[PDB]
PDB file of C-alpha atoms in Angstrom:
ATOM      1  CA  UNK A 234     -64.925 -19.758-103.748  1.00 48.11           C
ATOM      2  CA  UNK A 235     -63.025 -16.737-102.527  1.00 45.54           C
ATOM      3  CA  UNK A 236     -59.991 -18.765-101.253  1.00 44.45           C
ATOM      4  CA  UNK A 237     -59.627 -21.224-104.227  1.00 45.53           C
ATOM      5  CA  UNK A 238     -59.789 -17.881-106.731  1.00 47.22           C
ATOM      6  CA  UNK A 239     -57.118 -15.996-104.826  1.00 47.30           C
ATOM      7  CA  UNK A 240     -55.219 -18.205-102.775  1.00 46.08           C
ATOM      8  CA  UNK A 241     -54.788 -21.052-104.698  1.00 43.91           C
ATOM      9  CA  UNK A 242     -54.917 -19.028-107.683  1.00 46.13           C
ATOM     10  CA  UNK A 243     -54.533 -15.457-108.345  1.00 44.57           C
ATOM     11  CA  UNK A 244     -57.271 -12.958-108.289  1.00 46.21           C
ATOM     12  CA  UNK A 245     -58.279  -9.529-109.598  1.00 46.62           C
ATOM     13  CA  UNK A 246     -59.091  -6.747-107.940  1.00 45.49           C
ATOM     14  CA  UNK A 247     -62.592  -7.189-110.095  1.00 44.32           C
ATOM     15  CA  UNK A 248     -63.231 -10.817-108.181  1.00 45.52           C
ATOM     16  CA  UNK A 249     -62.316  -9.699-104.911  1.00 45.98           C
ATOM     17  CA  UNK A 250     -65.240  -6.614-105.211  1.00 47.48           C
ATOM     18  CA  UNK A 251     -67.323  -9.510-105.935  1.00 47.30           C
ATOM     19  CA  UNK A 252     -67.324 -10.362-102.068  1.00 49.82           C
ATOM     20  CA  UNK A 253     -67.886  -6.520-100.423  1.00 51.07           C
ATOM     21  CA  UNK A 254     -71.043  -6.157 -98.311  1.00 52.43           C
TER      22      UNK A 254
ATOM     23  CA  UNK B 233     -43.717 -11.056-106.858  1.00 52.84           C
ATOM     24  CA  UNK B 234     -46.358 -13.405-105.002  1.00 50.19           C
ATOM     25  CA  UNK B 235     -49.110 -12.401-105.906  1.00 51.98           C
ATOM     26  CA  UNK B 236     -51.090 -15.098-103.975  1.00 48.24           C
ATOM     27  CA  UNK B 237     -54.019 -13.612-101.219  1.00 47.53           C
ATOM     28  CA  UNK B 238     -54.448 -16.226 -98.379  1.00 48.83           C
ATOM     29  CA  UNK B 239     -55.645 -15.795 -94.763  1.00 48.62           C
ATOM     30  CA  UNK B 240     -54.981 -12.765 -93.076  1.00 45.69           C
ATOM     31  CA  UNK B 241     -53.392 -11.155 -96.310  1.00 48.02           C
ATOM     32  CA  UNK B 242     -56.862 -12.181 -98.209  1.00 45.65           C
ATOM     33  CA  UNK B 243     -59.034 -10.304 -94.949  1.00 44.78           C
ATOM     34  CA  UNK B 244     -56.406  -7.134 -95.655  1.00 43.56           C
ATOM     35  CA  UNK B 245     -57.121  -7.286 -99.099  1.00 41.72           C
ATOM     36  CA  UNK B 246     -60.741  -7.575 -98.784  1.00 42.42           C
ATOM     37  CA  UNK B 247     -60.430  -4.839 -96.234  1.00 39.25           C
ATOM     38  CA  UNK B 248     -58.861  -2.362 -98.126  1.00 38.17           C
ATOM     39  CA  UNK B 249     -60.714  -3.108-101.619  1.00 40.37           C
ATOM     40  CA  UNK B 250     -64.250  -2.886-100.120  1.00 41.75           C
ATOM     41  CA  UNK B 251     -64.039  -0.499 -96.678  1.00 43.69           C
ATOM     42  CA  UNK B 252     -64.840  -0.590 -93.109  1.00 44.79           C
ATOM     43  CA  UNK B 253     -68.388  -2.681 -94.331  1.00 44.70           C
ATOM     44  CA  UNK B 254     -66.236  -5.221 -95.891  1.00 43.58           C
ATOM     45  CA  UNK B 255     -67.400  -8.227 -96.695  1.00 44.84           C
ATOM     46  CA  UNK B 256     -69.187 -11.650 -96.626  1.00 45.98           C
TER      47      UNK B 256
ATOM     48  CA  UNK C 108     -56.160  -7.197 -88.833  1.00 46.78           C
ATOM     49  CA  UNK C 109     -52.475  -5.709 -89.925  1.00 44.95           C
ATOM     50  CA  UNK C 110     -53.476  -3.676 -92.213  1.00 43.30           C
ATOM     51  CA  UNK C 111     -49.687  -1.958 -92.910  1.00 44.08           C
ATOM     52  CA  UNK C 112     -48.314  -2.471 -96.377  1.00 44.25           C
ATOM     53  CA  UNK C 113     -44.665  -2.987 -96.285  1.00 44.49           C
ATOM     54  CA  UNK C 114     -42.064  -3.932 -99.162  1.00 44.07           C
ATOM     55  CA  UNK C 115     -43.738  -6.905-100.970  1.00 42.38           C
ATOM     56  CA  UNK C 116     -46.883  -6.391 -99.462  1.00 39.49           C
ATOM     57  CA  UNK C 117     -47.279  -3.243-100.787  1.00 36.09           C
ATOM     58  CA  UNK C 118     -45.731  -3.757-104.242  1.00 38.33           C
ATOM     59  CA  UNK C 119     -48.476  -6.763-104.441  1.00 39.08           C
ATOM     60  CA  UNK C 120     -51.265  -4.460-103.248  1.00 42.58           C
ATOM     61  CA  UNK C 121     -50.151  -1.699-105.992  1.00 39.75           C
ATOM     62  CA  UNK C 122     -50.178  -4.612-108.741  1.00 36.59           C
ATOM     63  CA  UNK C 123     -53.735  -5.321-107.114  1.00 36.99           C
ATOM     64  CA  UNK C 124     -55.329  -1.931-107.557  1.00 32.96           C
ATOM     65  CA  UNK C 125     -53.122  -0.468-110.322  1.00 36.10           C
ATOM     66  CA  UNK C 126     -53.188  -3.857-112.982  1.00 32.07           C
ATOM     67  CA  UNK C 127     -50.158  -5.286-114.801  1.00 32.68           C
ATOM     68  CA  UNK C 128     -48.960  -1.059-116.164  1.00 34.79           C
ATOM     69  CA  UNK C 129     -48.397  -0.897-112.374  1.00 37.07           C
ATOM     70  CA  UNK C 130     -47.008   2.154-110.326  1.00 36.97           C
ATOM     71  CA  UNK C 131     -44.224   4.805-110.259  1.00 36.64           C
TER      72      UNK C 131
ATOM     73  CA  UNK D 152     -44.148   9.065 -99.482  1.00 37.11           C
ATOM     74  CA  UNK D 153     -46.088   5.834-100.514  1.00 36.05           C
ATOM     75  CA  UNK D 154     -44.198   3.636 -97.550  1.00 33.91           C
ATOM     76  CA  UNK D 155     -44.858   6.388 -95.429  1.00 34.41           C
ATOM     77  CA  UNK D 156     -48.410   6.680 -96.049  1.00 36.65           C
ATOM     78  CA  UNK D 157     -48.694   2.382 -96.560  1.00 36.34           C
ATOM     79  CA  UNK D 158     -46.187   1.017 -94.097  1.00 32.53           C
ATOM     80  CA  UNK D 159     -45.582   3.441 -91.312  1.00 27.77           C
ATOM     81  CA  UNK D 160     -49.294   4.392 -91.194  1.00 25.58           C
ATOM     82  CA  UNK D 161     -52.553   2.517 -92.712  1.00 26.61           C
ATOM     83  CA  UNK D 162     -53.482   3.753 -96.571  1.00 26.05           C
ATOM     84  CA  UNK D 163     -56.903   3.550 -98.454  1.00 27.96           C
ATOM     85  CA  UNK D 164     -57.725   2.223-101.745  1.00 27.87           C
ATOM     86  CA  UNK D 165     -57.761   5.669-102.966  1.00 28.92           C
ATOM     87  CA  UNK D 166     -54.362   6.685-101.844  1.00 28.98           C
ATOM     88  CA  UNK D 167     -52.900   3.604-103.949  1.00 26.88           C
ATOM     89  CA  UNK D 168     -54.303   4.621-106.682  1.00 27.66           C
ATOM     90  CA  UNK D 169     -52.474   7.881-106.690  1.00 27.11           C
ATOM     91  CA  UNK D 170     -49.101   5.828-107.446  1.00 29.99           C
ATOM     92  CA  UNK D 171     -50.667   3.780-110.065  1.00 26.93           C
ATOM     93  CA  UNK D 172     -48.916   4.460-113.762  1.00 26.66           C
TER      94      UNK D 172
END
């Protein structure tokens, strides 16, 4: 999920728009 | 630079990327 | 939520929203 | 400037994106 794509790794700002209400 | 989003760093990202409605 | 960007914070942020090119 | 408008006080998406090359 949200943690393992940008915690443990590294994330976009494309993924992280994937989680907005 | 650490480019790594975890806890409260992940909510302020979320924050600022999506708005005030933020996220689920 | 802190929602201040300071020093590597915000250099992280700008590599967030601006890509790889980054910021001046 | 930037770490005024980031670090002293709270800054949008949109304001970023002014500084981005």
């Amino acid at each position: 999920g949200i943690v393992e794509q940008c915690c443990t790794s590294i994330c976009s700002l494309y993924q992280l728009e994937n989680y907005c209400n | 630079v650490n480019q790594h989003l975890c806890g409260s760093h992940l909510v302020e990202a979320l924050y600022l990327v999506c708005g005030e409605r933020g996220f689920f």
